[PDB]
Amino acid sequence: LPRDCQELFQVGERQSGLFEIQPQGSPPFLVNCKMTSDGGWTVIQRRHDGSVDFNRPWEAYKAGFGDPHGEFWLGLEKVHSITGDRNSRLAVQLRDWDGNAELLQFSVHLGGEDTAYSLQLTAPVAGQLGATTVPPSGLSVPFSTWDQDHDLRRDKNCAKSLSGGWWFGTCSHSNLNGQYFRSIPQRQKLKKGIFWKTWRGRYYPLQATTMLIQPM
């Protein structure tokens, strides 16, 4: 069995879809691979119609949930079995309600559960994401869900005030795992939506997202 999508690409697999892989120290599981000029990408998240509830607790974000032929979240322990401790490219694809698309890419490291699946960002990459003052040693941002939220403020639970699970560095940078919306609701619920502040705004609900990862 191939270790990951990139191994699949490297033996000549051309089609994007569902394939059986087995990383190190993992049981076999079925991934979504995307085959591109750039090689094999692992699809770790995909949203496009609001048919799958993303407002799930810690254990569901670890194991994964959703339809692998539709909207889904692959699962932090599956993603981390794929990346290991290797530097990885993370691709983030957004789509607004006018058909426009926005393609972003960041090199990251992803810790395991001992780190609560923290994203480890160098200072330049954290600068790319809008952090204006960061130590030269960078930034790690743990994953948070409503039942396991890492906002240090005794008053505030970021995941619980919004929706879904995410790397909430702040509570207003992004959340691609929020509540899916089609049109304008009555502000206090748009807070809880699918958003990426620096593209269409804090309160603009995205039509579609994909996240993909690829080691190195």
Residue numbers in the entry: 184 to 369, 371 to 400
How is this structure described in the published paper?
Parallel to this two other proteins have emerged – primarily from genetic studies – as being factors that significantly modulate plasma triglyceride levels and CAD. These proteins, human angiopoietin-like protein 3 (Angptl3; also known as Ang5) and angiopoietin-like protein 4 (Angptl4) are, as the names suggest, related structurally to angiopoietins which are involved in angiogenesis via their interaction with the Tie2 (tyrosine kinase with immunoglobulin and endothelial growth factor homology domain-2) receptor. Here we determined the structures of the fibrinogen-like domains of Angptl3 and Angptl4, structures which offer new insights into reported loss of function mutations, the mechanisms of action of the proteins and open up the possibility of rational design of low molecular weight inhibitors. The fibrinogen-like domains of Angptl3 and Angptl4 form compact structures and, according to fibrinogen nomenclature, can be divided to 3 subdomains A, B and P.
The Angptl4 crystal contains 1 molecule per asymmetric unit and the visible polypeptide chain begins with Leu184 and ends with Met400, hence 6 amino acids of the C-terminus are not visible. There is one break in the mainchain of Angptl4 at Gln370, suggesting the loop that it is in is flexible. The B subdomain of Angptl4 is similar to that of Angptl3; however, the extended β-sheet is formed by four antiparallel β-strands and instead of the long β-strand β6 in Angptl3, it contains 2 short β-strands (β6 and β7), which form an antiparallel β-hairpin and are connected via α-helix α5 and an extended solvent exposed loop. Similarly to Angptl3 it contains one disulfide bond (Cys341 and Cys354). Similarly angiopoietins 1 and 2 are the closest structural homologs of Angptl4, with rms deviation of 2.7 Å (200 equivalent Cα positions) and 2.6 Å (200 equivalent Cα positions) respectively. However, the β-sheet of the B subdomain is narrower in Angptl4 than that of homologous structures and β-strand β6 is much shorter and turns away from the β-sheet towards the solvent and together with β7, α5 and an extended loop creates a separate solvent exposed element in the structure. Analysis of the electrostatic surface potential of the fibrinogen-like domain of Angptl3 and Angptl4 revealed that the electrostatic charge is relatively evenly distributed over the majority of the surface of both molecules, except for the presence of an extended positively charged patch at the bottom of the P subdomain of Angptl4, the surface that is most likely involved in the functional interactions. For Angptl4 there are two reported mutations (P251T and R371Q) which are linked to increased triglyceride levels. Of the six mutants made in Angptl4, three gave no soluble protein (G223R, W349C and G361S) while one resulted in greatly reduced protein yields (R384W).
